[PDB]
Point group: C4
Chain length 451, copies 4
């Protein structure tokens, strides 16, 4: 038909395979670009993580590595000591810190003019809580009292906390640093502004106030730079864009020809989905994703985008798609095409059995959540329950799940017995039946392919 | 026959499928009710857990997060310091605690009138233990000496412990608090009474006295409440009850008609279990469970039931059952019905092989318990042994099991060799044979279904 | 033939199945005896473990739970402080300990008359080690200098350690205690003599001296006991012995009749292994094991055996065997016999493939040991390597194995690359081929059984 | 043909199997040599590890076991204290250490004449970093200022660190010790020179300076040794070499005869790869590896090679190969040859499906790296991503992977959703389809072998 023919068969009675060469070049350039981008991102992420760890060690009183989710205050003296230690360490940073930092001094909403640190309470507008008469009268609206501290170059120790009506206490300040680590990977050093927020959280009003530290980095270009002796990335990005544009044009032209031929055939006869060649759909999709991600990456490197997650997702999805596309060349042979056809034949029944098993799985997920949420730390949220069950049907973390309920045998024996029955039934049903049926489906598809 | 017919076939020669619509509505309402109940329970459980953690940090001397099962006293001075620290922290709570608590002051059996704390010894009536002459004379009956401490608004430091005859020392007090965290999820704040029990356990008489803290919360409604501006749950519960009642009535009427038709057929002829339609049995069971759980949940929200475990189990089992019921609609087609029929055909042989493999499994469980209980921390109880073996046949926690016995190679080499043989034999037998036979059973059932 | 017939078929043309009833009674009594013995052993083991933990906390300076394999001394002052603290805590035990202990005061080889504690050095007879001239002259023979301390009712702080030639330092003492915890499980309290050994080990001469504490309990009966109000076990043991003797006699008589019938058949004809009925061999073996274990258990309870490991192994193996014997009754039917016959048919090919795969497995074990012993903590000994590989082919502890070598990427990259190749090749080969062939063997056997 | 015949068939019409006996002897001697070498290496590795642990405990201020990757300095006072503590502990080692060590006193590049310790800064040649004006001017070239400390038998506390321009601080010294632990395994004690390097790493300039200690041991023979009473290894090594040489000669002669016979056959006829007998190729390869490894091991024991990794890899690969060679004798039968032929038939399709699945796997690896590197500690490098995914398709470490992303749900929900989709899709695709197809391939190959 000279259409739908295989490529080796076009070559026998036609032109050269000049469009299959373009695709492998696209795979090469996309992979190289992704690798380079990932290396640079690794460097930046390591810098930010190390700076945040140093900030925690400098500003959190009595902080040790690994005590992040449990780190909390339990007495009023503890809270006062933590707050004052954080402020004093802010005031002594140029003399005690191993890094080099600069003060920012306002220019924003939380901080007034000439103010570098903001110590602010947040409490209810009116709170009259007494448990002796079992009475209360609360106006929920949150009032903020902010204390401003000028960086060194007074009344922050006069702070009086409204403990019974407190919502949270927060400390806000920024630090300016220069990334000198970026020099090893060529490059010109960047200027980082770390926005540090320390939260003393009392929303639960349970007598336990967790303490956490978070940072938000804003990267700029340092004015007046000099490295005494110091385009490739931009040129490679435009090379990727040009190759992707050519691939998109060729695939679109091929799809248009296919649609025109389908229309001619349907006119002749006076199954339309068999004229589509979804490999080209995949190529076009990865093509658009690559182009969008490359523009976003160029902006990020030009320092005016700072949207790393979307660009990373776009480029990663495009790379995954272009690597999936080698199956197209693997089907051009026979001994690989038999396996690929086996998978293609097996897929629909696999999805249908996934529907049934997943309905049962959702039932088990809801039951496990509602029953073992109060007791099992692995069953707190619905997504956590789903992850636990999914890892449990694959033979992972089973004994810890059983032991976390053994640690309750003293408490409700009804709950312990229900947990035993639930876990045993679910694991047996999904290991001995569902996975075995998946294996049987694949084996049957392979048998039909061979026969 | 116009009975046992499929639904699409009733529609061709009869009425509309107005009872299949009722079931999906039931699934929707049951799932929504369960989700809402689970969210509220999550909030309450988090409040209780945080309060208990704060209590432990406030009252246990030298307590750190993670030291719960190992936390213990080893010297008489340590025991005295822990007890006195607990009592003093009880006396200083209004001045040191980050939360707001109120004293309860008796009104109960452990505490006398106007007493908030109870420090009580429990020792044998007569204990004369000497190991030098290898003699003893004990009257086991336990005597209690209770010390009552009035909350602040004297002789507890004169406590003298009968160490050689001591059974345990316990501290009992209650704290009243108001749940202000419940405001974020709408609601009117609840009043919590925490019953705190601190146990210094000396039942083993081994020179090691574990220390633990447990709480029991009693939730009431706060009299005279006010939130300045602040039925849906009750109405949705009665909606669920009404839908469930209608479903139960319809299923019961259908079952009665089926039984009458079976009786007519057996009269005509002058296999009875093939006239039952167990889908309707499942629907009725989930129906009764949902109604009972909804009444219990209404009582709990009305604050006069406080039986959370039974209601949660009822609602979770009902939700699991109603989600299993979508297989009924999946069998109405063909490509799903083949898989469901494969599972149905495979089930009996699976249960029979479960019987045989489980008999072997029980033999191994008893042997492993009796031999590795003294040495392996994973083999202490029969249920623990069963969980360990079950997770071991699924490829989980194998190397830790081997290493816990490698940590004994220095001690009995006979025991180490037996553990090696036992573990290797059990794992090989249950991985390479039993699971493979389960897979073979499912594959054979699939083959018969296709052929 | 009225021999080899099934039991339901004997009943049709003969007597009643009065020997199958005896076997289920044997299973019942053996299981009950094992459960009771296990409960008592649990109690004793818990007592010993708690006493040892208390001893460690009392006598090891700066000891914390979990620091058992890493607990060590690194300076001469540290060693001196640890030794003196141990001796002083021995001298202050009656005034500081929460338990009740008695001194033993000699009557043995390590301790002289009227001596309760033995502080002894062990050093080379002649040691002249200098690393400056790279010379040494050692006479390896170990000399012991023992210091005897009288229990309270002097020159141990004058100890001078020969550090350069030291082998080890050991402390030996005994404590007498009475097990009062045994009263809860009825019983009359036992008298325990704990032999405590503290070792300061310097055999490696590496500047790191590990410190460990071990105990050896010797349980006796307390003379002149009294519990004011306080045979079943002995009678149940003799009941088990009698039932086992009857079962052994019946099985032996049946085997003798079978051998006589085989001889008659071979005489008639002028395959011998098909006249054995190995079920009866299993019954006789479990019978002998049960009788031996019961005599040993009676001796242990009579307090003059103290050989717990052998008795536990005997009774556990017997219980496992008697529970395996229910397959005999499961084969009497058809739907269970098909599965059991499938396993019987599959077994020989499974063992042969085990031989081949195990030869490859031994090759991999030797290679992994010799290469990753110096670097990987999981590959230190051959048995550890075998356990690691066996758990690795079952999908357990794979990422930790990979990460322990990632923690070396900085050191030898040749070793890291070899570890990558070795692990990937071994896991792929034993997951995708060997286990799949085991599954194929079982599936084929099932197919032949059905066909 | 009297060629390609089986061995039992040669014996019927020819000579005795005198070359199969040589191979089992080779297996025996290779295994014994490897075991002995591994035991000696275990001893040496344990000595080095214990010495390094003692060095860390002696020289790192506030160091605890397990704090190796997190151990770091955060303040200038902390850095100064750590450096001075390390130097002072170097100066007090002969009086405080439990081991026996000797000073080395120069004779090298880092240390001047008569200097044992080198305290050296490394900073940029010109560093003018200010973040207030967002300006810098750096000359990257690294300048070193070395402080030399004479071992005891002054101005190191006058050290002034250029914090803003610092790269790293390093301490270099050597210690001489004699391995007395080697005496237990016979042997004459060795002389060890430990090269100790302590690094205070500030390459990231993030305010966090990690501290690490590494050692490099150089083992010599101690001059003038004496153990008062104290060839087998050398003789056994030459025995292995001789057996290997004979095996290599026989296999080479057989291969030459096979090639000559192939040439004669191709001349007669006027498939060549079927005259090779790759078993002999494997034997020759393991033979060369064994000989090379044995020469290297003899050199190492003679103390003038010190190249342990290459020798260990050579000997381990040779042992693995010689153990793989028992399959040759297992194929000589029939019931084993069927299984081996099944594996041989299945192998090519397995490799082709490995190609396809690995292309998809590489796509997923790149996507997972680029997206979850910034957030997931398990996805930092490409090799780490590959190990994580490979262990994830085998049911290992799944819930920890899910939980490390649950710990981010608060941060980017787009990233969390992408991680959920990515993990679920990858695990489902590679568990329910790829492994099932591998099983189907093996089952089909087994079916063709039987039929
Ligand atoms: Cl329902 C669901 C929720 C969340 C995540 C997943 Cl992977 C699922 C499932 N998709 O289909 C089934 C299949 C059988 C248990 C898994 C695999 C289940
Ligand atoms: Cl016996 C038993 C006790 C406790 C829990 C369970 Cl899941 C069982 C079993 N039920 O049947 C067998 C099947 C083969 C090992 C499991 C699965 C075993
Ligand atoms: Cl060789 C060996 C040594 C130690 C322990 C065991 Cl379980 C073995 C094996 N027995 O046969 C094979 C089978 C394939 C890997 C296991 C299972 C291997
Ligand atoms: Cl691509 C790759 C990179 C690194 C390590 C390995 Cl093991 C591989 C693979 N080799 O082929 C496939 C097969 C399917 C997932 C594994 C097994 C994959």
């Amino acid at each position: 038909y000279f259409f739908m023919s295989p490529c080796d068969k076009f070559r026998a009675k036609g032109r050269k395979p000049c469009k299959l060469m373009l695709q492998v070049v696209k795979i090469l350039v996309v992979t190289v670009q992704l690798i380079l981008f990932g290396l640079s991102n690794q460097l930046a992420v390591t810098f930010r993580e190390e700076n945040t760890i140093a900030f925690r060690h400098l500003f959190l009183l009595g902080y040790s590595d690994g005590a992040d989710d449990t780190f909390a205050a339990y007495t009023r003296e503890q809270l006062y000591q933590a707050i004052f230690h954080a402020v004093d360490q802010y005031l002594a940073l140029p003399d005690v810190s191993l890094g080099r930092y600069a003060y920012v001094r306002g220019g924003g909403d939380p901080w007034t003019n000439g103010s570098g640190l903001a110590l602010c309470q947040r409490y209810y507008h009116r709170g009259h809580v007494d448990p002796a008469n079992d009475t209360f009268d609360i106006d929920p609206m949150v009032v903020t009292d902010c204390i401003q501290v000028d960086p060194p170059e007074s009344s922050y120790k006069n702070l009086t906390l409204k403990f019974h009506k407190l919502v949270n206490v927060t400390i806000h300040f920024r630090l300016k640093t220069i990334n000198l680590q970026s020099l090893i990977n060529n490059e010109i050093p960047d200027c980082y502004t770390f926005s540090v927020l320390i939260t003393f959280d009392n929303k639960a009003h349970s007598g336990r106030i967790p303490i956490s530290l978070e940072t938000q980095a804003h990267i700029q270009e340092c004015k007046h730079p000099s490295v005494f002796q110091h385009s490739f990335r931009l040129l490679f990005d435009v090379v990727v864009i040009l190759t992707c544009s050519l691939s998109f044009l060729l695939c679109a032209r091929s799809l248009l020809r296919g649609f025109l031929l389908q229309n001619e055939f349907v006119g002749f006869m006076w199954e339309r989905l068999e004229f589509v060649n979804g490999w080209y759909i995949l190529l076009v999709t990865s093509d658009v994703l690559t182009i969008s991600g490359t523009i976003m990456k160029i902006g990020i490197e030009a320092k005016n985008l700072a949207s790393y997650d979307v660009c990373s997702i776009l480029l990663g999805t495009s790379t995954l798609l272009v690597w999936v596309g080698v199956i197209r060349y693997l089907t051009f042979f026979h001994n690989y095409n038999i396996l690929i056809a086996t998978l293609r034949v097996a897929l629909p029944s696999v999805m249908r059995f996934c529907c049934c098993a997943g309905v049962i799985y959702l039932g088990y997920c809801f039951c496990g959540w509602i029953v073992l949420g109060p007791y099992h730390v692995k069953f707190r949220s619905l997504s956590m329950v789903s992850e636990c069950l999914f890892s449990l049907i694959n033979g992972d973390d089973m004994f810890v799940t059983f032991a976390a309920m053994q640690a309750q045998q003293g408490r409700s024996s009804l709950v312990w017995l229900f947990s035993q029955l639930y876990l045993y039934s679910f694991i047996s049903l999904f290991i001995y039946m569902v996975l075995s049926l998946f294996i049987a489906l694949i084996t049957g598809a392979y048998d039909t392919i061979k026969h």
